[PDB]
Amino acid sequence: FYTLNIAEIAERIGNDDCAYQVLMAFINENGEAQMLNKTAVAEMIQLSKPTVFATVNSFYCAGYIDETRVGRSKIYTLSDLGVEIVECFKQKA
Amino acid sequence: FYTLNIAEIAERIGNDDCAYQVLMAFINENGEAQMLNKTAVAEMIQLSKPTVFATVNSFYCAGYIDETRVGRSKIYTLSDLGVEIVECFKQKA
Amino acid sequence: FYTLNIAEIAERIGNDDCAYQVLMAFINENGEAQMLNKTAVAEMIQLSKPTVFATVNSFYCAGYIDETRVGRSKIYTLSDLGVEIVECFKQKA
Amino acid sequence: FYTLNIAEIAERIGNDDCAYQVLMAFINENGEAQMLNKTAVAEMIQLSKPTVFATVNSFYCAGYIDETRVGRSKIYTLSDLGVEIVECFKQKA
Amino acid sequence: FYTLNIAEIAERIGNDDCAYQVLMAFINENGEAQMLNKTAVAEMIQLSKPTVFATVNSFYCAGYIDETRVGRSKIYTLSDLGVEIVECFKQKA
Amino acid sequence: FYTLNIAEIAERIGNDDCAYQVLMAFINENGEAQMLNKTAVAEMIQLSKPTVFATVNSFYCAGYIDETRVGRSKIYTLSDLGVEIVECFKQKA
Amino acid sequence: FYTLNIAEIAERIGNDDCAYQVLMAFINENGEAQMLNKTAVAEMIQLSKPTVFATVNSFYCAGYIDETRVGRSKIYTLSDLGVEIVECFKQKA
Amino acid sequence: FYTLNIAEIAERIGNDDCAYQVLMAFINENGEAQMLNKTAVAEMIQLSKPTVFATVNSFYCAGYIDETRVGRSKIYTLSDLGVEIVECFKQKA
Amino acid sequence: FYTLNIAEIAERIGNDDCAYQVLMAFINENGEAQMLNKTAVAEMIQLSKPTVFATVNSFYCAGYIDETRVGRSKIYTLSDLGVEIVECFKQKA
DNA sequence: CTTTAAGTTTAACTTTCAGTTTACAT
DNA sequence: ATGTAAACTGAAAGTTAAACTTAAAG
């Protein structure tokens, strides 16, 4: 339905500390994408649960992270869109 | 760069109270899209500033709302993408 | 009820520093009309709040600027009359 | 160039203490319109010079009051438009 | 109470430089009667303030010029008697 | 040609120290009207020559005092109009 | 204190060219008594200033002419006694 | 260090109801391998928690299932060895 | 079919009390491997029958212990793989 | 952001002094 | 007829009050 420029998105995220760290949390010590529950993310970055959780929620809405039911809770991984956004940043650095 | 299905997004937002209300806040009494600062939104919906602000920020990242500098602060309006998402909901109702 | 000559008005405003700057404040860097709260205007031009606010108020009375409720405060945009007055000035310059 | 509804204007002025009193100052004890310098007006109503003066200036821009040079200063009288606005109020009362 | 011959008065004024110029000061470039403060008159004719002011005062006593309060000062216009006296002179010239 | 109300004139003169004293100077110790040259008047009242002389001149224009050549100078007496004005004051007192 | 025969006086004056002309100088072309300064009299009759002035002075002493201050000089008119003396002469002629 | 015959293993598992069902639990409705927490597995098959959990633990020791930390708990997926064992069974059926 | 690293296995077992004790139960007072029925093992270590039995079963599946029919029941001994795993532990200690 | 107070600037009110002319006296 | 004195007119020299604007405080 709608075409998306991945460079603008990455540009926007880069200008917003919380979005940026929420995104990068899913990338591990060896550069590999990983699974995380909401609590892990909030613990990993130094921002409050409300901030981090709301960001996680919106990023799943945006389709940047995936949600999958696991136990009676949920886990988050970067979507293919998520991984592509992360790539723009890696190239900068 | 990336194609987007507007129905899935709307589906995701509809399953998340905060995202949904943050989005609809921009639609006024007469059905018209309107401008809002971050404070207006948080005051309008009954959720905490941290939740609402983080959601506003991520929605601008996603390209659902636009940011424009005004005074030395910012204001938010739905993008064309934002308006299209709102339309799916209007059709449901 | 009453017909108005837009040239005389513009002539009057041009002979009055405060009116003139209050009017032009609403025109942005790219020539586009923008929204502003009362504080933005007073901060933007180098005149005191009382002067600027009273001018804003009277200009809304005159129908040169519009008022719209937003949060529990108000915002100002040029009316169609406002835009037409601004055009006379642009043509001079 | 532009048509004006006198009822809306009067409606706007009635919702603004300063505009209203600045306007009515020109109507005397016997209901007759009178001439006033800027100082007279500010002295007559209980608002600060900056407020009153800026209002007087904008009302002359709007064409509600007339300016005429007298000595090396100026004096203000209601225009025909001014008188017509005053009439709407008289009818209310 | 007392009848007045306008020709004698004009005759008297014509034989007195100061009276004459004080009177004519109120007649403008286009032949139209105008308003003036005391200072304007003294500046307009080349006689000292004391002379001009005393003449203005006496001419208001005589009923040749009118006084009207304006700001917290006064302004002078020819009365109907004043205008009639000016007419005798215009006819000479 | 023109009818005159003697009460208004007296009212005007009574509100003007110089006019008033210039007029009364012609009334002597015993209530009798007397003759005076311009210098006598200025010496008699405590105002400057320019003020007093200009007032004398205008009062002769107005027809309140008479002028008569005497030596190669002039002398002033109240006219019948002058005497009638003086009477209004006497009645007050 | 002392009674005076007006016929003897007139008889005496008639026998003295200077007295006679000094007296008659005050009677004008139309038979009317008039005001004169000392210089006027001496100019009017063909006798020297010293003669005429001394005569004027003595005639004021005698009470035949009146003196009145006018400017910072004096003027002379016939007294009632003066007029009565003039009448005896008019009757002769 | 040590070579393994996948057929013998599958043969052994097939002769043991619990092992077999613990293994197959990870294969979903569409034949796809899935993630599961320990509780999911015990709920899915009709054997007691102690039995199922101990089996899960030993199967991770054996290298048949993988463990990954997620929240502050763990999740299990078949290893490549696990998938290969499952394939022998699929071929039987 | 599949190669196995004996160090990883031993590492996994060492992080799991039950697996570890089930394994070591087969090593006797003098360091010699011994035969045991399922009941012996559960009695020897202080864990419940269900836990111990399920572990024994899975360890036979894994090929770590051997099963041999004896009477109409079964007995367990470490396989060569079992003995090799036990050796890694002995070396640690 | 608004109101009040203080300071500065502009405008208005004119008064005083000097010179010239006229009148009076010697 | 001339000289001196007085009066009047004209020209030159400022102070006070009011209004407006700006700054500070609430």
Side-chain angles (χ1 to χ4, degrees), chain H residues 1-9 12-13 16 18-19 48 50-52 54-67 80-81 84, chain I residues 1-9 12-13 16 18-19 48 50-52 54-67 80-81 84:
Chain H
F1 257 121
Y2 211 77
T3 309
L4 222 63
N5 177 2
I6 299 170
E8 272 206 8
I9 301 163
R12 282 161 194 235
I13 291 170
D16 170 25
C18 180
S48 59
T51 300
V52 177
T55 306
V56 169
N57 292 328
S58 297
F59 277 2
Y60 163 73
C61 286
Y64 300 165
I65 80 198
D66 282 338
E67 185 171 78
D80 292 357
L81 183 42
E84 272 179 319
Chain I
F1 258 121
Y2 211 77
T3 309
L4 222 63
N5 177 2
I6 299 170
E8 272 206 8
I9 301 163
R12 282 161 193 235
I13 291 170
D16 170 25
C18 180
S48 59
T51 300
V52 177
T55 306
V56 169
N57 292 328
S58 297
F59 277 2
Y60 163 73
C61 286
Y64 300 165
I65 80 198
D66 282 338
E67 185 171 78
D80 292 357
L81 183 42
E84 272 179 319

Coordinates of all heavy atoms in Angstrom, one line a residue, chain H residues 1-9 12-13 16 18-19 48 50-52 54-67 80-81 84, chain I residues 1-9 12-13 16 18-19 48 50-52 54-67 80-81 84:
Chain H
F1 N 34.9 -34.9 18.6 CA 35.4 -36.0 19.5 C 34.8 -37.4 19.3 O 35.4 -38.4 19.3 CB 35.3 -35.6 21.0 CG 36.6 -35.1 21.6 CD1 36.7 -33.8 22.2 CD2 37.7 -36.0 21.7 CE1 37.9 -33.4 22.7 CE2 38.9 -35.5 22.2 CZ 39.0 -34.2 22.8
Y2 N 33.4 -37.4 19.1 CA 32.7 -38.6 19.1 C 31.6 -38.7 18.0 O 30.8 -37.7 17.9 CB 32.1 -38.9 20.5 CG 31.9 -40.4 20.8 CD1 33.0 -41.1 21.2 CD2 30.7 -41.0 20.7 CE1 32.9 -42.5 21.5 CE2 30.5 -42.4 21.0 CZ 31.7 -43.1 21.4 OH 31.5 -44.5 21.7
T3 N 31.6 -39.7 17.2 CA 30.7 -39.8 16.1 C 29.4 -40.5 16.6 O 29.4 -41.4 17.4 CB 31.3 -40.5 14.9 OG1 32.5 -39.9 14.5 CG2 30.3 -40.4 13.7
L4 N 28.3 -40.0 16.0 CA 26.9 -40.4 16.4 C 26.1 -40.9 15.3 O 26.0 -40.3 14.2 CB 26.3 -39.1 17.0 CG 25.5 -39.2 18.3 CD1 26.4 -39.7 19.4 CD2 24.9 -37.9 18.5
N5 N 25.4 -42.0 15.5 CA 24.5 -42.5 14.5 C 23.1 -42.1 14.8 O 22.5 -42.4 15.9 CB 24.6 -44.1 14.5 CG 23.6 -44.7 13.6 OD1 22.8 -44.0 12.8 ND2 23.5 -46.0 13.5
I6 N 22.5 -41.3 13.9 CA 21.2 -40.6 14.2 C 20.1 -41.6 14.2 O 19.0 -41.4 14.8 CB 21.0 -39.4 13.3 CG1 22.1 -38.3 13.5 CG2 19.6 -38.7 13.5 CD1 22.1 -37.2 12.5
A7 N 20.2 -42.7 13.5 CA 19.2 -43.7 13.4 C 19.0 -44.5 14.7 O 17.8 -44.7 15.1 CB 19.5 -44.7 12.2
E8 N 20.1 -44.8 15.4 CA 20.0 -45.5 16.7 C 19.3 -44.6 17.7 O 18.4 -45.1 18.4 CB 21.4 -45.9 17.2 CG 21.9 -47.2 16.8 CD 22.9 -47.8 17.8 OE1 23.1 -47.2 18.9 OE2 23.5 -48.9 17.5
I9 N 19.6 -43.3 17.8 CA 19.0 -42.4 18.7 C 17.5 -42.3 18.4 O 16.8 -42.6 19.4 CB 19.6 -41.0 18.5 CG1 21.1 -41.0 18.7 CG2 19.0 -40.0 19.4 CD1 21.9 -39.8 18.2
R12 N 15.9 -45.3 19.7 CA 15.8 -45.3 21.1 C 14.6 -44.4 21.6 O 13.7 -44.8 22.4 CB 17.1 -44.9 21.8 CG 18.1 -46.0 21.8 CD 19.5 -45.4 22.1 NE 20.5 -46.5 21.8 CZ 21.4 -47.0 22.6 NH1 21.7 -46.4 23.8 NH2 22.2 -48.0 22.2
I13 N 14.5 -43.2 21.0 CA 13.5 -42.3 21.4 C 12.1 -42.8 21.1 O 11.1 -42.7 21.9 CB 13.7 -40.9 20.7 CG1 15.0 -40.2 21.3 CG2 12.5 -40.0 20.7 CD1 15.5 -39.0 20.6
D16 N 10.1 -44.9 23.7 CA 10.0 -44.1 24.9 C 9.1 -42.9 24.8 O 9.5 -41.9 24.2 CB 11.4 -43.7 25.4 CG 11.5 -42.7 26.6 OD1 10.5 -42.7 27.4 OD2 12.5 -42.0 26.7
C18 N 7.7 -40.6 26.5 CA 8.0 -39.2 27.0 C 9.0 -38.5 26.1 O 8.7 -37.4 25.6 CB 8.5 -39.3 28.5 SG 8.8 -37.6 29.2
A19 N 10.2 -39.1 25.9 CA 11.2 -38.6 25.0 C 10.6 -38.1 23.7 O 10.8 -37.0 23.3 CB 12.3 -39.6 24.8
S48 N 3.6 -35.5 33.7 CA 3.8 -34.6 34.8 C 5.0 -33.6 34.6 O 5.9 -34.0 33.8 CB 4.1 -35.4 36.1 OG 5.2 -36.2 35.9
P50 N 7.6 -32.9 36.5 CA 8.9 -33.5 36.8 C 9.4 -34.3 35.7 O 10.6 -34.2 35.3 CB 8.6 -34.4 38.1 CG 7.4 -33.7 38.7 CD 6.6 -33.1 37.6
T51 N 8.6 -35.2 35.1 CA 9.0 -36.0 34.0 C 9.4 -35.2 32.8 O 10.5 -35.3 32.3 CB 7.8 -37.0 33.6 OG1 7.6 -37.8 34.7 CG2 8.2 -37.9 32.4
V52 N 8.5 -34.3 32.4 CA 8.8 -33.5 31.2 C 10.0 -32.6 31.4 O 10.8 -32.5 30.5 CB 7.6 -32.7 30.8 CG1 7.9 -31.8 29.6 CG2 6.4 -33.6 30.5
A54 N 12.6 -32.9 33.4 CA 13.9 -33.6 33.5 C 14.3 -34.1 32.1 O 15.5 -34.1 31.8 CB 13.7 -34.8 34.4
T55 N 13.3 -34.5 31.3 CA 13.6 -34.9 29.9 C 14.1 -33.7 29.1 O 15.0 -33.9 28.3 CB 12.2 -35.4 29.3 OG1 11.7 -36.5 30.1 CG2 12.5 -35.9 27.9
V56 N 13.5 -32.5 29.2 CA 13.9 -31.3 28.6 C 15.4 -31.0 28.9 O 16.2 -30.8 28.0 CB 13.0 -30.1 28.9 CG1 13.6 -28.8 28.5 CG2 11.6 -30.3 28.3
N57 N 15.6 -31.0 30.2 CA 17.0 -30.8 30.7 C 18.0 -31.8 30.1 O 19.0 -31.3 29.6 CB 17.1 -30.8 32.3 CG 16.4 -29.6 32.9 OD1 16.4 -28.5 32.3 ND2 15.8 -29.8 34.1
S58 N 17.7 -33.1 30.1 CA 18.6 -34.0 29.6 C 18.8 -33.9 28.0 O 19.9 -34.0 27.5 CB 18.2 -35.5 29.9 OG 18.2 -35.7 31.3
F59 N 17.7 -33.6 27.3 CA 17.8 -33.3 25.9 C 18.6 -32.1 25.5 O 19.2 -32.1 24.4 CB 16.4 -33.3 25.3 CG 15.8 -34.6 25.0 CD1 16.5 -35.8 25.3 CD2 14.5 -34.7 24.4 CE1 16.0 -37.0 25.0 CE2 14.0 -36.0 24.1 CZ 14.7 -37.1 24.4
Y60 N 18.6 -31.1 26.4 CA 19.6 -30.0 26.2 C 21.0 -30.4 26.5 O 21.9 -30.0 25.8 CB 19.2 -28.8 27.1 CG 20.3 -27.8 27.3 CD1 20.7 -26.9 26.2 CD2 21.0 -27.7 28.5 CE1 21.7 -26.0 26.4 CE2 22.0 -26.8 28.7 CZ 22.4 -25.9 27.6 OH 23.4 -25.0 27.8
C61 N 21.2 -31.3 27.5 CA 22.5 -31.9 27.7 C 23.1 -32.6 26.5 O 24.2 -32.4 26.1 CB 22.5 -32.8 29.0 SG 22.4 -31.8 30.5
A62 N 22.2 -33.5 26.0 CA 22.5 -34.3 24.8 C 22.7 -33.5 23.6 O 23.3 -33.9 22.6 CB 21.3 -35.3 24.6
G63 N 22.3 -32.2 23.6 CA 22.5 -31.3 22.5 C 21.3 -31.4 21.4 O 21.5 -31.0 20.3
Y64 N 20.2 -32.0 21.9 CA 19.1 -32.2 21.0 C 18.2 -30.9 20.9 O 17.6 -30.7 19.9 CB 18.2 -33.4 21.4 CG 18.9 -34.7 21.4 CD1 18.4 -35.8 22.1 CD2 20.1 -34.9 20.7 CE1 19.0 -37.0 22.1 CE2 20.8 -36.1 20.7 CZ 20.2 -37.2 21.4 OH 20.9 -38.4 21.4
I65 N 18.1 -30.2 22.0 CA 17.5 -28.9 22.1 C 18.4 -27.8 22.5 O 19.4 -28.1 23.3 CB 16.1 -29.0 22.9 CG1 16.4 -28.9 24.4 CG2 15.3 -30.2 22.6 CD1 15.3 -29.3 25.3
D66 N 18.2 -26.6 22.1 CA 19.0 -25.5 22.5 C 18.3 -24.7 23.6 O 17.1 -24.6 23.7 CB 19.2 -24.5 21.3 CG 20.3 -25.0 20.4 OD1 21.2 -25.9 20.8 OD2 20.3 -24.6 19.2
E67 N 19.1 -24.0 24.4 CA 18.6 -23.1 25.4 C 19.0 -21.7 25.1 O 20.2 -21.5 24.7 CB 19.1 -23.6 26.8 CG 18.6 -22.9 28.0 CD 19.1 -23.6 29.3 OE1 20.2 -23.4 29.6 OE2 18.3 -24.4 29.8
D80 N 20.1 -28.4 15.4 CA 20.2 -29.0 14.0 C 20.2 -30.5 14.2 O 19.6 -31.2 13.3 CB 21.5 -28.6 13.3 CG 21.4 -27.1 12.9 OD1 20.4 -26.4 13.2 OD2 22.4 -26.6 12.4
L81 N 20.7 -31.0 15.3 CA 20.7 -32.4 15.6 C 19.2 -32.9 15.9 O 18.8 -33.9 15.4 CB 21.6 -32.7 16.8 CG 21.8 -34.1 17.4 CD1 22.0 -35.2 16.4 CD2 23.0 -34.0 18.3
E84 N 17.3 -33.1 12.7 CA 17.6 -34.3 12.0 C 17.0 -35.6 12.5 O 16.5 -36.4 11.8 CB 19.2 -34.4 11.9 CG 19.8 -33.7 10.7 CD 21.3 -33.9 10.6 OE1 22.0 -33.8 11.7 OE2 21.8 -34.0 9.5
Chain I
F1 N 27.1 -40.5 11.5 CA 26.2 -39.4 10.9 C 26.5 -38.0 11.5 O 26.5 -37.0 10.8 CB 24.7 -39.7 11.1 CG 24.0 -40.2 9.9 CD1 23.4 -41.5 9.9 CD2 23.9 -39.4 8.7 CE1 22.7 -42.0 8.8 CE2 23.3 -39.9 7.6 CZ 22.7 -41.2 7.6
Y2 N 26.8 -37.9 12.8 CA 26.9 -36.6 13.5 C 28.1 -36.6 14.5 O 28.2 -37.5 15.3 CB 25.6 -36.2 14.2 CG 25.4 -34.8 14.2 CD1 25.0 -34.0 13.1 CD2 25.6 -34.1 15.4 CE1 24.7 -32.7 13.2 CE2 25.3 -32.7 15.5 CZ 24.9 -32.0 14.4 OH 24.7 -30.6 14.4
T3 N 28.9 -35.6 14.4 CA 30.1 -35.5 15.3 C 29.7 -34.8 16.6 O 28.9 -33.8 16.5 CB 31.3 -34.9 14.6 OG1 31.5 -35.6 13.4 CG2 32.5 -35.1 15.5
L4 N 30.4 -35.2 17.7 CA 30.0 -34.7 19.0 C 31.2 -34.3 19.7 O 32.2 -34.9 19.8 CB 29.4 -35.9 19.7 CG 28.1 -35.7 20.6 CD1 27.0 -35.2 19.7 CD2 27.8 -37.0 21.3
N5 N 31.1 -33.1 20.3 CA 32.1 -32.6 21.2 C 31.9 -32.9 22.6 O 30.9 -32.5 23.2 CB 32.2 -31.0 21.0 CG 33.3 -30.4 22.0 OD1 34.0 -31.1 22.7 ND2 33.3 -29.1 21.9
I6 N 32.7 -33.8 23.2 CA 32.5 -34.3 24.6 C 32.7 -33.3 25.7 O 32.0 -33.4 26.7 CB 33.4 -35.6 24.8 CG1 33.0 -36.7 23.8 CG2 33.2 -36.2 26.2 CD1 33.9 -37.9 23.8
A7 N 33.4 -32.2 25.4 CA 33.6 -31.1 26.3 C 32.3 -30.3 26.6 O 32.0 -30.0 27.7 CB 34.8 -30.2 25.9
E8 N 31.6 -30.0 25.5 CA 30.4 -29.2 25.6 C 29.3 -30.0 26.4 O 28.7 -29.4 27.3 CB 29.8 -28.9 24.3 CG 30.3 -27.6 23.6 CD 29.3 -27.0 22.7 OE1 28.1 -27.5 22.6 OE2 29.6 -26.0 22.0
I9 N 29.2 -31.3 26.1 CA 28.3 -32.2 26.9 C 28.6 -32.1 28.4 O 27.7 -31.8 29.1 CB 28.3 -33.6 26.3 CG1 28.0 -33.7 24.8 CG2 27.4 -34.5 27.1 CD1 28.4 -34.9 24.2
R12 N 27.6 -29.0 29.9 CA 26.1 -28.9 30.1 C 25.7 -29.7 31.3 O 25.0 -29.2 32.2 CB 25.4 -29.4 28.8 CG 25.3 -28.3 27.7 CD 25.0 -28.9 26.3 NE 25.3 -27.9 25.3 CZ 24.5 -27.5 24.4 NH1 23.3 -28.0 24.2 NH2 24.9 -26.5 23.5
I13 N 26.2 -30.9 31.4 CA 25.8 -31.8 32.5 C 26.3 -31.2 33.9 O 25.5 -31.2 34.9 CB 26.4 -33.2 32.3 CG1 25.7 -33.9 31.2 CG2 26.4 -34.0 33.6 CD1 26.3 -35.2 30.7
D16 N 23.9 -28.9 35.8 CA 22.6 -29.5 36.0 C 22.7 -30.6 37.0 O 23.2 -31.7 36.7 CB 22.0 -30.0 34.7 CG 20.8 -30.9 34.8 OD1 20.0 -30.8 35.8 OD2 20.6 -31.7 33.8
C18 N 20.9 -32.8 38.6 CA 20.3 -34.2 38.4 C 21.1 -35.0 37.4 O 21.5 -36.1 37.8 CB 18.9 -34.1 38.0 SG 18.0 -35.7 37.8
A19 N 21.3 -34.4 36.2 CA 22.1 -35.1 35.2 C 23.4 -35.6 35.8 O 23.8 -36.7 35.6 CB 22.4 -34.2 34.0
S48 N 13.6 -37.2 43.4 CA 12.5 -38.1 43.3 C 12.6 -39.1 42.1 O 13.3 -38.9 41.2 CB 11.2 -37.2 43.0 OG 11.4 -36.4 41.8
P50 N 10.5 -39.9 39.7 CA 10.2 -39.3 38.4 C 11.3 -38.6 37.7 O 11.6 -38.8 36.6 CB 9.0 -38.4 38.7 CG 8.4 -38.9 39.9 CD 9.5 -39.6 40.7
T51 N 12.0 -37.7 38.5 CA 13.1 -37.0 38.0 C 14.3 -37.9 37.5 O 14.7 -37.9 36.4 CB 13.6 -36.0 39.1 OG1 12.6 -35.0 39.3 CG2 14.8 -35.2 38.6
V52 N 14.7 -38.8 38.5 CA 15.8 -39.7 38.2 C 15.5 -40.6 37.1 O 16.3 -40.8 36.2 CB 16.2 -40.4 39.5 CG1 17.3 -41.4 39.1 CG2 16.6 -39.4 40.6
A54 N 13.3 -40.4 34.5 CA 13.2 -39.7 33.2 C 14.6 -39.3 32.7 O 14.9 -39.4 31.5 CB 12.4 -38.4 33.3
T55 N 15.5 -39.0 33.6 CA 16.9 -38.6 33.3 C 17.6 -39.9 32.8 O 18.4 -39.8 31.8 CB 17.6 -38.1 34.6 OG1 16.9 -36.9 35.1 CG2 19.1 -37.7 34.2
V56 N 17.5 -41.0 33.5 CA 18.0 -42.3 33.1 C 17.6 -42.7 31.7 O 18.4 -43.0 30.8 CB 17.6 -43.4 34.1 CG1 18.0 -44.8 33.6 CG2 18.3 -43.2 35.5
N57 N 16.3 -42.6 31.5 CA 15.7 -42.9 30.2 C 16.3 -42.0 29.1 O 16.8 -42.5 28.1 CB 14.1 -42.7 30.2 CG 13.5 -43.9 30.9 OD1 14.0 -45.0 31.0 ND2 12.3 -43.6 31.5
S58 N 16.4 -40.7 29.3 CA 16.9 -39.8 28.3 C 18.4 -40.0 28.0 O 18.9 -40.0 26.9 CB 16.7 -38.3 28.6 OG 15.3 -38.0 28.7
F59 N 19.2 -40.3 29.1 CA 20.6 -40.7 29.0 C 20.9 -42.0 28.2 O 21.9 -42.1 27.6 CB 21.2 -40.7 30.4 CG 21.7 -39.3 30.9 CD1 21.4 -38.2 30.1 CD2 22.3 -39.2 32.1 CE1 21.8 -36.9 30.5 CE2 22.7 -37.9 32.5 CZ 22.4 -36.8 31.8
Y60 N 20.0 -42.9 28.3 CA 20.0 -44.1 27.4 C 19.7 -43.7 26.0 O 20.3 -44.2 25.0 CB 19.1 -45.2 27.9 CG 18.8 -46.2 26.9 CD1 19.8 -47.2 26.5 CD2 17.5 -46.3 26.3 CE1 19.5 -48.2 25.5 CE2 17.2 -47.3 25.3 CZ 18.2 -48.2 24.9 OH 17.9 -49.2 24.0
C61 N 18.7 -42.8 25.8 CA 18.4 -42.3 24.4 C 19.7 -41.6 23.8 O 20.0 -41.9 22.7 CB 17.3 -41.3 24.4 SG 15.7 -42.1 24.7
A62 N 20.3 -40.7 24.6 CA 21.5 -40.0 24.2 C 22.7 -41.0 23.9 O 23.6 -40.6 23.3 CB 21.8 -39.0 25.3
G63 N 22.6 -42.2 24.5 CA 23.7 -43.2 24.3 C 24.8 -43.0 25.4 O 25.9 -43.5 25.2
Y64 N 24.4 -42.4 26.5 CA 25.4 -42.2 27.5 C 25.4 -43.4 28.5 O 26.4 -43.7 29.1 CB 25.1 -40.9 28.4 CG 25.1 -39.6 27.6 CD1 24.5 -38.5 28.1 CD2 25.7 -39.6 26.3 CE1 24.6 -37.3 27.4 CE2 25.7 -38.4 25.6 CZ 25.2 -37.2 26.1 OH 25.2 -36.1 25.4
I65 N 24.2 -44.0 28.6 CA 24.2 -45.3 29.4 C 23.6 -46.4 28.5 O 22.8 -46.1 27.6 CB 23.4 -45.1 30.8 CG1 21.9 -45.1 30.5 CG2 23.8 -43.8 31.5 CD1 21.1 -44.5 31.7
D66 N 24.0 -47.6 28.8 CA 23.5 -48.8 28.1 C 22.4 -49.5 28.9 O 22.3 -49.4 30.1 CB 24.6 -49.8 27.9 CG 25.5 -49.4 26.7 OD1 25.1 -48.6 25.8 OD2 26.6 -49.9 26.7
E67 N 21.5 -50.1 28.2 CA 20.4 -50.9 28.8 C 20.6 -52.3 28.4 O 20.9 -52.7 27.3 CB 19.1 -50.4 28.3 CG 17.9 -51.0 28.9 CD 16.6 -50.2 28.5 OE1 16.2 -50.5 27.3 OE2 16.1 -49.3 29.2
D80 N 30.7 -46.3 26.5 CA 32.0 -45.8 26.3 C 32.0 -44.3 26.2 O 32.9 -43.6 26.7 CB 32.7 -46.4 25.0 CG 33.0 -47.9 25.1 OD1 32.7 -48.4 26.2 OD2 33.5 -48.4 24.1
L81 N 30.9 -43.8 25.7 CA 30.6 -42.3 25.7 C 30.5 -41.8 27.1 O 31.0 -40.8 27.5 CB 29.4 -42.1 24.8 CG 28.9 -40.7 24.5 CD1 30.0 -39.7 24.2 CD2 27.9 -40.7 23.3
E84 N 33.7 -41.7 28.9 CA 34.5 -40.5 28.4 C 34.1 -39.2 29.0 O 34.9 -38.4 29.4 CB 34.6 -40.5 26.9 CG 35.7 -41.3 26.3 CD 35.7 -41.3 24.7 OE1 34.6 -41.3 24.1 OE2 36.8 -41.2 24.1

